[PDB]
Amino acid sequence: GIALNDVMADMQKASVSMQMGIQVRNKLVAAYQEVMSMQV
Amino acid sequence: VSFAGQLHAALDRISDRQAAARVQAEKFTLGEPGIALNDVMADMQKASVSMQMGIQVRNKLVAAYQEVMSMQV
Amino acid sequence: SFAGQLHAALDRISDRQAAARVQAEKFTLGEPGIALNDVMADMQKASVSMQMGIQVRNKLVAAYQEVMSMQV
Amino acid sequence: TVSFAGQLHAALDRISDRQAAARVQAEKFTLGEPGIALNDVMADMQKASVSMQMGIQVRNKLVAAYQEVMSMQV
Amino acid sequence: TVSFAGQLHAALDRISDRQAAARVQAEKFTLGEPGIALNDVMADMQKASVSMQMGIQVRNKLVAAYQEVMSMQV
Amino acid sequence: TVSFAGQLHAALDRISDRQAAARVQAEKFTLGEPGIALNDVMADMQKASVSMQMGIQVRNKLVAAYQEVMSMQV
Amino acid sequence: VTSEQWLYWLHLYFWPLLRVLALISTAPILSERAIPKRVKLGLGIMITLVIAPSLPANDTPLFSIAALWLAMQQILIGIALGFTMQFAFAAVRTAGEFIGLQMGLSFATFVDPGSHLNMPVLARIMDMLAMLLFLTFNGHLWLISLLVDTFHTLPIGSNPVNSNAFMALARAGGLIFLNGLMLALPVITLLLTLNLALGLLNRMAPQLSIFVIGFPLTLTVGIMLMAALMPLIAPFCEHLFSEIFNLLADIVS
Amino acid sequence: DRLDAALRFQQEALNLRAQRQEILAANIANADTPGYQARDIDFASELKKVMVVDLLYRVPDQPSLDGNTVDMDRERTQFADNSLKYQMGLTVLGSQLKGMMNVLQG
Amino acid sequence: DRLDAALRFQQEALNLRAQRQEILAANIANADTPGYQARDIDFASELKKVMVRGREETGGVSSPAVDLLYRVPDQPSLDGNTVDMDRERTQFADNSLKYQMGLTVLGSQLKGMMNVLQG
Amino acid sequence: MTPESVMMMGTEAMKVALALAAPLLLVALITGLIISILQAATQINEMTLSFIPKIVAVFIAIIVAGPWMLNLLLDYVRTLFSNLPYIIG
Amino acid sequence: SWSLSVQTLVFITSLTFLPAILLMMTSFTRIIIVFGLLRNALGTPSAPPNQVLLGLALFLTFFIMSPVIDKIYVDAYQPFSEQKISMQEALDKGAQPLRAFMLRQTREADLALFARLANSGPLQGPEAVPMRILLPAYVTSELKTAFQIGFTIFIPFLIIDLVIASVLMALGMMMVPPATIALPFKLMLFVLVDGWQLLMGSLAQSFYS
Amino acid sequence: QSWSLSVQTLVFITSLTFLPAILLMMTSFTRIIIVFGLLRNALGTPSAPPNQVLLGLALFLTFFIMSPVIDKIYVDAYQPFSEQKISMQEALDKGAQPLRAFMLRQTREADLALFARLANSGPLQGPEAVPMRILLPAYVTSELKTAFQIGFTIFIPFLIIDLVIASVLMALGMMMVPPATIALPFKLMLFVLVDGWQLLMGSLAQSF
Amino acid sequence: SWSLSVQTLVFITSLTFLPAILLMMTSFTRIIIVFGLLRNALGTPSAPPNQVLLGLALFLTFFIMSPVIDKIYVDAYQPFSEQKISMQEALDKGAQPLRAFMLRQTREADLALFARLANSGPLQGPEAVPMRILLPAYVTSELKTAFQIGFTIFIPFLIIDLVIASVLMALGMMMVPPATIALPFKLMLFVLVDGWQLLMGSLAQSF
Amino acid sequence: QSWSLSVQTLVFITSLTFLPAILLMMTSFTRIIIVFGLLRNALGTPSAPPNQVLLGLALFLTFFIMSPVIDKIYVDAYQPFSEQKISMQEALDKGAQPLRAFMLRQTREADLALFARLANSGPLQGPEAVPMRILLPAYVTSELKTAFQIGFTIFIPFLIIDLVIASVLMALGMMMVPPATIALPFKLMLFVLVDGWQLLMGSLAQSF
Amino acid sequence: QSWSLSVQTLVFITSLTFLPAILLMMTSFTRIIIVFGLLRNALGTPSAPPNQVLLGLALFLTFFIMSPVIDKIYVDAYQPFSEQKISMQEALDKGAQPLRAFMLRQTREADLALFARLANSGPLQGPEAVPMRILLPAYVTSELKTAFQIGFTIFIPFLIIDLVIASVLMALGMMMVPPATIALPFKLMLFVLVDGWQLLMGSLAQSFY
């Protein structure tokens, strides 16, 4: 069956990919709120 | 079936393994025939490894939850 | 100018990372002439350079945000 | 007239001097110099590390104070 | 007539006296003064470390609380 | 009628009486009173240590939750 | 055993979460700053937990430009839905502000445009009345349901897109004005007549009128007129919500 | 306390091993006393009784003239075995406590 | 895809280290069995093979698709096994250190990435 | 909860506003009209002398009817806050 | 049952989600939104230094959730602490009173919508609703109720500004800001009509009704 | 009976987390800070003195007001506890008394009655029967109400100046000027010629 | 191709400048200024919320960038997958449509001024204008274009206001303010002619 | 009596934490900052000089004004401490004296009396023995009052300009012409011609 | 004599935090954005171009203005630093001189004299010996004065337009017509036909020379 070598490696990736998604969304949301907080 | 179900299944499996190792250790300490010290010690080793795996999974899972709850909305 | 200097710095950091990774890869295959201590030292130097780049990026981004938040 | 820039420069020079002295002593000890002992080398390196950590912490506190003061609405 | 600065000064001074006493006891033991036991030296050193760590934690909590109180929008 | 303060007091009491019982057992075993065994002394001390670690971890979780709730803006 | 494939779960739970949270941050009432951020995040997380297992999971890696295109698509869909919904409240605010400006409530804008002195209090009154009506008609549940439904029409997977469709949302900018006039056409008209009446008074003995007799009379008349006109917004409120909703349904596809 | 229930079995086993170790060493020490009977305890039954002591006489193997029934070989083997089992119980109890600790550390 | 490809070499090397250590432990276990030729794998060639073509299994009783080669015996033995204990324990220790090296490299890379995704 | 209830409470609210503002506005309007007709009769025309008695009249209006407004608005707010948990949906 | 190590691990992990329980399963949410809206209404966006409002909301929630906590303790925590009910059954036993409170206040339309979105079968009675349907339905109902309460709260504080602006405009003082005049009067109103006792009692009734 | 020293250290270092909460909810900080914020709003300028200065000044005022209570606590609880004459729990119980009296003296009856109604309290009896968990929210509510009462009457003179200046300006004819712009210097003049800061501190201190 | 971690760092760093890209590189400034001036024209500085105007400008910007986005997709998004071209060269190729667009929308005078501000003498060709000289010139050209469009919008509303005031004066009224009378007529003219859709059509035609 | 080195560095870092509070409540930063904000409000340009520019100017002016006090602290207190001549406690006590003297020079006796009477301090003979806990709030209050006085006085010439332009526009019949649009350029011209910035900074420095 | 690598990295990262302060108090930025803050007031539209557009335009103009100074710093100081022929201390000493000269040429003598007197500095032999603590605030003061001069001069043609339009409106008996709304489109006309933005930026750049 699946060994610790594979389990840990995929677990870490998934953590890395989730962190990347969170950071990119945070950047996009911050940019959008900066645009909408404008004064026209 | 679901993620909570999978986590519950993993916890039950780990606890069952630990309880089996503990019961075999108590049976050996009891003096009942047929139980070898080799098997007791190896099963305790396996139970410790499984506990450590569960601890690591919990640590990461908590870290990921904290990361998500920090996400800006 | 300034963008050119930033590009040069990023290129140097990435060359550091690539050299360290290639040396570790060659050492993994068992190639002779590459020692473990050199591999570890190069890896740590690459990590230090990358952390310096990250810190410089953070300071520059904070400065840009502070400048752009002024009330004209 | 006491100036804060002069004091900061003096503190940085002291930290750099301690670090350089420790580094020079370690380099000389590696080269097989007779009149240098290992315990002194390690103790000097640890003292230099402590001094540089103190400098880093003071810089962090100063930067926090400056960023708090410059974030006012006047 | 209770002054919080006075109590902070008292606690800081008490920590200082504990550290100085442990340092002087170790100093005297090193010089080979009869009547000093190694176990008591180590015990008093560890007590001094515990007192200093308690002071560090109290300072951390007070500074954090002051920064949370001092950053509210009035 | 439940009481969270009462529950915390009961838990702190449980920890404190466990620690005091282990301490008194060590007291009697050091004094030389018959009937006390060294392995029991060590086991009770380790049980008290585990209980205190339980308390420390629950404290950490509760303080973190309270700080995150109180750091929110309405 | 003990697999727990994490990438599959992450890719199944991520993109629906992105779309739901993008709608949440812009949809009216669900995007108001008074809600704590964690409440909004938890609502999005729970909605995704309910919805995602039924959807086909995507396999594009998070470390690819395809992931960036997907994220841009979800953000676009969510903000488009929320903004098209917000257009109705924009129209109500416009109508209220215009009724208030014909009240003479803020006369300083005619002399100093945008001079940090403006109080569209009627606009706020009818804006919060419109929010109360939207809450009553359960518009937010509909919004959530349509956010779910746009999957069948437009799946998570990158799909090609159209053009004049965007114009439609931009062209919805006309409705804010058009429907706005439809809310202000009766009352303003009578106010207009009142002002006309005041003109007849000024055609008599010069000066000694307007700025001394016109303002209180027109203020009281506007107050009681639109107090009587309050029962009228609710059918127009439902009309506005229906317009926004079926425009969204027609154009999102 | 629930913590006691988890560690009750190993603590009782460890205490019983220590008591039986003392009894065996008393048998060794009194090997030369004429008229001394070699006493021992049945580990399993007493462990049941404590979890839910009485001394049993050892069956003599060789008849001595002074009435001493202590046999060197039998009790030396039992002493070594009890030492080994005491070490094993210490190992198991320490492992359980260390696991309970790494669950909490963080 | 990009992150998966960047971390694939060290991950595969670490998996091959694990399989080689399983083989070496099997050799150590069978060290007193009469008529057992010691088995070992060529790490570099099998590592390149697994990278170019993905990992595969004989069945799945399951086992890897690695080529189990025979070790040349040092000195003869009447029972008929070629497990020389010095060679086994040297390869075991070397594989141990190389597996720890792989863990260190992979952990360093993953931190080197969390540092970036850390703002 | 029903839209009829929403519009009824809105209408009652804004009639309360009308009752609060009607005395002051009406007093100001009457003073302005009186000063204007006096100006027309006397053939006097300055746009500033109509502003003088208006302030005094409107300020007296709070003296006389101010307690009534303060008692009406407080009663309205009190009743609204008391009936808040019965118009929930 | 689980091993003691597993039980301790689960207990420590579950201690993390306390803010989530407070925000998404408790009265705290519609005990705050109202406070934020009221603070927006009076024109003092700082006034009660937040922390003050958070502490008041925490005490109000503790006073309001008292019967639910009592029922959980008597039915789940007491048997669990006395080794009569296992750790994996105390959670299930205690999740029922909270689920019932979560229902007593969760509207229908939301329940129907989230029963449709899950593609679940017909729910003839409330006893067939799982937590996966009740959670977001309760959250949405609480948000809507809080916003309704706040929006009927907002009306008098805008009425005062309206009448202030109209009175200022009657006399021709068109360049006087109305907000600066209205703020002291809004404070006077909120002082006079027991601003907080009435609001506190109204919120508490809004829960128990 | 006494707690172990490890338990005492744990409780003592955990209790320091509630220091901002104690200062805000339980002391005079809330009323002073609310009055100060309302006074800036009333001055015509929203952020003339930085929030930091006002926060530090409010902290000093709170310390000076509460110094008698702190002295009573030190005499009753801190001093006999530090000399190892009473336990920790009994020291806390004894030291809660002067703070309870201070909280009661400024507590509205209606607030206490309401929060006793919501806590199912039945036969209360002596003012010395109110529990801390009932007394605290009533004290907070009374403090908020009192701060609002002080603020809305602090607002009065500046409204008087604003109305007088606007009326004079418009009656004179210059109706296109912004009255607030001309009024702000006069608000500052009134605040400095009355000694507004000193008198305001005197009033805030006397309010207790 | 350089390191993946450096690529992640650069990507997340470049994500920060998204408002800068939207404002300086696209047309968003033009639509936002046109909307602000149009709002100032009708006499109501808060009739449509700033949020709604910003979102409408965002949608208009997305449509009017759709051809440039398509060119970017053809030149950068697709070949980055087939790996015929990738990395910084593909990034420059994808940025090329943005130049072409910004060259199209930029006046010659602004580019000439910003070149003589950088001492770039040998800038002879018009497709090799550096970004440093192209960007602020493009922004200034956008400001001028937006102001011109705002004045063109202003003309009819100014005419209506003047006509209303003239009729009020001719009819004998000397005290009635013409703004109150002219506001609803401004709105009925704006709605009746359907000003909004023609305005967006002209803006799209304005490129 | 001398603190051990670890305690000394703990005190040093903890004191460095309190740096903005010392700058705001013990130096001349607060008065300069308040006057600058009021001046910016007075010109009709609420955001013309960015907050960071004015904050930097106030910081430099504060450093220049407090240079004599810092020199006294260095010569009398810090220099012997750096040469290990005196301990940290006595060095801090010696360094308090010049700063207090400076703060006492710029405080009002009425505020000192208010805070002394509020704190129930016993009779104090002369300025030699006044606790810092008493002097700091009184100095802060005096600084606030002085800053408001200076700002209100500064508000006068711009008020003159606004009134004269409004009257000139009104006497011409221009009833609906707002005076702010015409007054702002002339306010800028007035401030430029009188060399306003350097004159105001010199006046602020001379008042200390 | 050279600093250690750790100290050099610490100093560099610490000095990276002062970037907005350096930009405001040492470069051209202060004069530019302030003028923009006034220009948007002169046009009658406080909204104007958005704040971020003006800030970025000022940043680009500042970079173009300081291109010679940046080039001189790069040549004289940073190039030996990269090519290892200088230390960090000597680089900091040498690179500031061109920037000090740039600051001095735009510094009014009166402000410099004021800050000398206020620091009680000794007799400065010549410009070259002026301390930075004296040159920085004096430069900021002169910068503010020059920016206000430029802004007031800018305010002129729009005042001309407003006065002419108001006089035309009043000469026709149209007394009740607010001239601001009428004159705003003509201000936009004036800024468009004369190419106001390009002319203003050219004037600013030439002013710094």
Author numbering:
A (entry chain K): 65 to 104
B (entry chain P): 32 to 104
C (entry chain L): 33 to 104
D (entry chain M), E (entry chain N), F (entry chain O): 31 to 104
G (entry chain E): 4 to 256
H (entry chain U): 3 to 54, 83 to 136
I (entry chain Q): 3 to 62, 78 to 136
J (entry chain D): 1 to 89
The paper states:
Given the high fragility of the C ring, we examined several reagents as the media of density gradient centrifugation in the purification of the intact C ring-containing basal body–hook complex in the default CCW state from our previously constructed ΔfliCD strain of S. Typhimurium, which lacks the flagellar filament, thus avoiding effects of the filaments on purification of the motor. Local refinements of the LP ring, MS ring, rod, hook and export apparatus generated their high-quality cryo-EM density maps at the resolutions ranging from 3.0 Å to 4.3 Å. The LP ring acts as a bushing to stabilize the rotation of the rod, which serves as the drive shaft. The hook functions as a joint that connects the motor to the filament, which acts as a propeller to propel bacteria for swimming in liquid medium and swarming on solid surface. In the intact C ring-containing basal body–hook complexes, there is one more peptide loop L3, which consists of the residues G310–P322 of FliF and is also extended from the β-collar region of the MS ring, bound in a hydrophobic groove that is formed by the α2–α3 linking loop of FliE6 with the D0 and DC domains of FlgC1 and FlgC6 on the surface of the rod.
The bacterial flagellar motor is a huge bidirectional rotary nanomachine that drives rotation of the flagellum for bacterial motility. The cytoplasmic C ring of the flagellar motor functions as the switch complex for the rotational direction switching from counterclockwise to clockwise. The basal body is made up of the LP ring, MS ring, C ring, rod and export apparatus. Here, we present two high-resolution cryo-electron microscopy structures of the C ring-containing flagellar basal body–hook complex from Salmonella Typhimurium, which are in the default counterclockwise state and in a constitutively active CheY mutant-induced clockwise state, respectively.
